Amino acid sequence: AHGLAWSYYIGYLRLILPGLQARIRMFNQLHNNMLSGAGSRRLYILFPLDCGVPDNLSVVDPNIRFRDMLPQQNIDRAGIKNRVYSNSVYEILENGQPAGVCILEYATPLQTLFAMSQDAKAGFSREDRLEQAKLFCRTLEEILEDVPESRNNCRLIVYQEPTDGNSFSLSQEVLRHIRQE
Amino acid sequence: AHGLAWSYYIGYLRLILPGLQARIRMFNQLHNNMLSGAGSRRLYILFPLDCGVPDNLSVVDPNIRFRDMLPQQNIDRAGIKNRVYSNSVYEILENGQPAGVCILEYATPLQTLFAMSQDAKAGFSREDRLEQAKLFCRTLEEILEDVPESRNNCRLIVYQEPTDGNSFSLSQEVLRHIRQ
Numbered sequence: 001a002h003g004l005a006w007s008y009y010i011g012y013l014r015l016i017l018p019g020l021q022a023r024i025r026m027f028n029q030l031h032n033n034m035l036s037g038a039g040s041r042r043l044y045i046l047f048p049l050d051c052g053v054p055d056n057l058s059v060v061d062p063n064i065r066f067r068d069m070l071p072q073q074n075i076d077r078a079g080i081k082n083r084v085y086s087n088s089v090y091e092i093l094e095n096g097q098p099a100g101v102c103i104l105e106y107a108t109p110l111q112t113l114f115a116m117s118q119d120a121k122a123g124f125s126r127e128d129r130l131e132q133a134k135l136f137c138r139t140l141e142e143i144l145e146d147v148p149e150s151r152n153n154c155r156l157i158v159y160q161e162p163t164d165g166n167s168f169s170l171s172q173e174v175l176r177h178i179r180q181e
Numbered sequence: 182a183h184g185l186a187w188s189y190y191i192g193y194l195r196l197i198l199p200g201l202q203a204r205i206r207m208f209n210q211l212h213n214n215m216l217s218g219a220g221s222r223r224l225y226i227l228f229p230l231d232c233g234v235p236d237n238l239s240v241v242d243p244n245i246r247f248r249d250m251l252p253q254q255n256i257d258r259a260g261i262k263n264r265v266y267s268n269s270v271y272e273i274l275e276n277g278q279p280a281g282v283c284i285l286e287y288a289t290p291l292q293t294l295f296a297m298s299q300d301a302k303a304g305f306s307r308e309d310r311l312e313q314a315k316l317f318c319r320t321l322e323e324i325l326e327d328v329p330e331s332r333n334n335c336r337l338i339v340y341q342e343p344t345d346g347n348s349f350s351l352s353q354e355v356l357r358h359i360r361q
């Protein structure tokens with residue numbers, strides 16, 4: 001879990017965070033300042049301790065409408081010439097009404113904890129996986145503290161879906177994070 | 182390291198290997214079948230055990246020259262709508278003359294072992310890093326043999342490039358694996 005936190009910061013957040021505000025700048029110029037509230041000039045990393053990583057947010061919850069991509073950023077990265085970073089902008093709805101707009105993705109290494117929890121040889125329990133997901137969640141911040149960009153640029157949304165999955169909506173969790181801030 | 186093998190397989194290779202031949206085929210249709218050879222239709226993953234992951238292949242070896250991109254694949258992945266996957270095709274020179282064409286990139290997560298080795302608080306030596314690199318490699322090899330999509334789509338190029346000197350040719354290492 002220590003290794004995943006470092007890996008994620010070094011493999012991704014280190015590369016995308018620096019150039020993110022420049023990309024919001026141009027997005028607002030061309031899309032009539034959709035991302036106005038400084039609260040929505042941040043990257044929102046969904047960190048379900050669930051360790052579930054679905055592909056489509058509109059499918060998990062229909063109240064997270066996809067509205068637009070950021071502008072693409074091309075980085076020369078590890079033997080890829082012009083690796084392409086696309087980031088998705090979402091509108092969050094409440095009772096039919098647009099209650100928010102933000103840059104939403106999941107922390108992908110979390111699926112590693114899930115996959116590894118299920119391995120027959122070196123597997124472990126849902127409760128041990130919950131513990132490793134927390135060590136991950138905690139460790140990312142201590143690395144995160146030291147880097148001047150970071151805090152202004154992205155925010156972790158940490159959450160545990162009930163044993164069902166119902167009685168819980170992810171739109172409500174996202175809305176309560178932007179509103180609190 | 183156990184964690185990096187699973188993370189690299191689960192979070193990247195799982196996603197990109199199934200579409201690769203379909204992408205090589207469209208590429209071949211628009212680039213006078215540049216990837217004609219059998220050696221030319223694998224994703225080759227550079228696995229330097231020194232965990233040196235530089236960003237440019239023409240800079241590391243002048244006999245590896247960028248030719249073109251595969252067509253992109255668009256994948257809905259962990260809240261990114263149409264996340265963009267690209268892969269780079271390179272001509273491999275021998276005696277100043279084109280000898281091979283292939284899809285080439287580094288195993289990015291090795292950068293983690295490198296940064297950890299450079300961390301003053303980690304207390305993680307170069308000897309300890311090499312042992313993790315080898316364990317990463319091995320655990321990745323064990324995952325890939327156990328998956329059908331690896332057989333004709335994926336090849337690990339694992340090398341121990343010495344600290345100093347020029348006795349190691351990445352180009353020739355790549356041309357070795359390409360012909361086998």
Ligand SMILES: O=C(Nc1cc(F)c(F)cc1C(=O)O)c1ccc(-n2ccnc2)nn1
Pocket residue numbers: 007011080083084108109112185188189190192193265266267268289290
């Ligand atoms: O290693 C990669 N990804 C990951 C590795 C992890 F270990 C992990 F836990 C999560 C990921 C992840 O991508 O989410 C990776 C490598 C190359 C490219 N790529 C090259 C051109 N276009 C895209 N993209 N991703």
Ligand SMILES: O=C(Nc1cc(F)c(F)cc1C(=O)O)c1ccc(-n2ccnc2)nn1
Pocket residue numbers: 004007008011012084085086087105108109188261264265289290291293
């Ligand atoms: O987690 C990622 N990457 C990695 C994570 C690792 F733990 C690692 F060791 C290596 C990587 C890597 O990408 O090389 C990641 C996540 C999202 C995006 N992305 C791309 C376009 N929109 C979003 N790209 N990468």
